[PDB]
Design an enzyme around this catalytic site. Structure first.
Site, PDB file in Angstrom:
ATOM      1  N   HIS A   1      -1.300   7.058   7.933  1.00  9.79           N
ATOM      2  CA  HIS A   1      -0.357   7.966   7.293  1.00  9.79           C
ATOM      3  C   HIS A   1      -1.018   9.324   6.954  1.00  9.79           C
ATOM      4  CE1 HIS A   1       3.430   5.867   6.634  1.00  9.79           C
ATOM      5  NE2 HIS A   1       2.887   4.906   5.920  1.00  9.79           N
TER       6      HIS A   1
ATOM      7  N   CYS B   1       7.031  -0.614   6.677  1.00  6.27           N
ATOM      8  CA  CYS B   1       6.513   0.624   6.031  1.00  6.27           C
ATOM      9  C   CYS B   1       7.581   1.189   5.117  1.00  6.27           C
ATOM     10  CB  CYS B   1       6.064   1.611   7.120  1.00  6.27           C
ATOM     11  SG  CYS B   1       5.762   3.282   6.489  1.00  6.27           S
ATOM     12  N   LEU B   2       7.185   1.741   3.969  1.00  7.93           N
ATOM     13  CA  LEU B   2       8.189   2.257   3.019  1.00  7.93           C
ATOM     14  C   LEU B   2       8.985   3.434   3.590  1.00  7.93           C
ATOM     15  CD1 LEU B   2       6.163   2.084  -0.331  1.00  7.93           C
ATOM     16  CD2 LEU B   2       7.285   0.252   0.908  1.00  7.93           C
TER      17      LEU B   2
ATOM     18  N   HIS C   1      -3.295   1.172   8.216  1.00  2.00           N
ATOM     19  CA  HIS C   1      -1.933   1.694   8.093  1.00  2.00           C
ATOM     20  C   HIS C   1      -1.902   2.963   7.201  1.00  2.00           C
ATOM     21  CE1 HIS C   1       2.593   0.875   7.775  1.00  2.00           C
ATOM     22  NE2 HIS C   1       2.375   1.777   6.826  1.00  2.00           N
ATOM     23  N   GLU C   2      -2.548   2.881   6.042  1.00  2.00           N
ATOM     24  CA  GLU C   2      -2.531   4.008   5.153  1.00  2.00           C
ATOM     25  C   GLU C   2      -3.364   5.168   5.632  1.00  2.00           C
ATOM     26  OE1 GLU C   2      -0.274   3.819   2.979  1.00  2.00           O
ATOM     27  OE2 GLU C   2       0.064   1.720   3.082  1.00  2.00           O
TER      28      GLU C   2
ATOM     29  N   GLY D   1       0.841  -1.154   0.000  1.00  2.00           N
ATOM     30  CA  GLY D   1       0.000   0.000   0.000  1.00  2.00           C
ATOM     31  C   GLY D   1       0.890   1.222   0.000  1.00  2.00           C
TER      32      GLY D   1
ATOM     33  N   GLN E   1       3.631  10.093   1.909  1.00  2.00           N
ATOM     34  CA  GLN E   1       4.873   9.383   1.784  1.00  2.00           C
ATOM     35  C   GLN E   1       5.670   9.839   0.601  1.00  2.00           C
ATOM     36  OE1 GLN E   1       2.977   5.299   2.347  1.00  2.00           O
ATOM     37  NE2 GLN E   1       5.066   5.019   3.299  1.00  2.00           N
TER      38      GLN E   1
HETATM   39 ZN   LIG Z   1       3.686   2.934   5.722  1.00  2.00          ZN
END
Ligand SMILES: [Zn+2]
Length: 159
Positions: A148, A102-103, A144-145, A49, A54
């Site tokens: 963010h 997470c990225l 999670h998203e 995702g 981000q």
């Molecule tokens: Zn993340």
């Protein structure tokens, strides 16, 4: 398609409340391009995702795209969904815990408790209203998203 730079934990862009996508942005080439760049970026980093903050875009757009990959060898595969202005309308009282990465958090994984089920209402990129029920690992990605978009990284949710 372009692969965009990704903000890392400690950068303040990741702490803001992302602004909702406005009416005139819906069904715009702007918005299609934003989503395409996000999608390419996620794929390039083996994400399941991604959220617009981000990639330094403080807007309420996310992609939910559970698929097995090196980072998540056991993830179920769904067709990737792009969500504009997502709102979680219901969280189940039932919990599941799973390992998340997470990225934006290089080289740290942690155990996170999430609602087993979420009901989310959102707009498509064209602007149409959709409500969808998610369970399990896809539900955890949705949570999670959305976190963010609200300035929250998974490290803060470690019980
Ligand atoms: Zn993340």
């Amino acid at each position: 398609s372009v692969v965009l730079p990704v903000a890392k934990r400690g950068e303040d862009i990741l702490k803001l409340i992302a602004a909702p996508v406005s009416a005139n942005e819906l069904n715009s080439n702007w918005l299609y391009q934003l989503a395409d760049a996000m999608h390419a970026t996620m794929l390039e980093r083996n994400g399941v995702g991604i959220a617009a903050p981000q990639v330094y875009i403080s807007k309420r757009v996310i992609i939910v795209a559970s698929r097995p990959n090196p980072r998540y060898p056991d993830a179920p595969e769904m067709n990737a969904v792009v969500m504009v202005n997502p709102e979680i309308l219901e969280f189940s009282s039932e919990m599941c815990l799973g390992e998340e990465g997470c990225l934006s958090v290089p080289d740290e994984r942690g155990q996170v408790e999430r609602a087993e089920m979420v009901k989310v209402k959102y707009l498509t990129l064209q602007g149409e209203m959709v409500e969808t029920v998610f369970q399990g690992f896809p539900a955890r990605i949705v949570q999670h998203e959305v976190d963010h978009l609200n300035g929250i990284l998974f490290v803060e949710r470690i019980s």
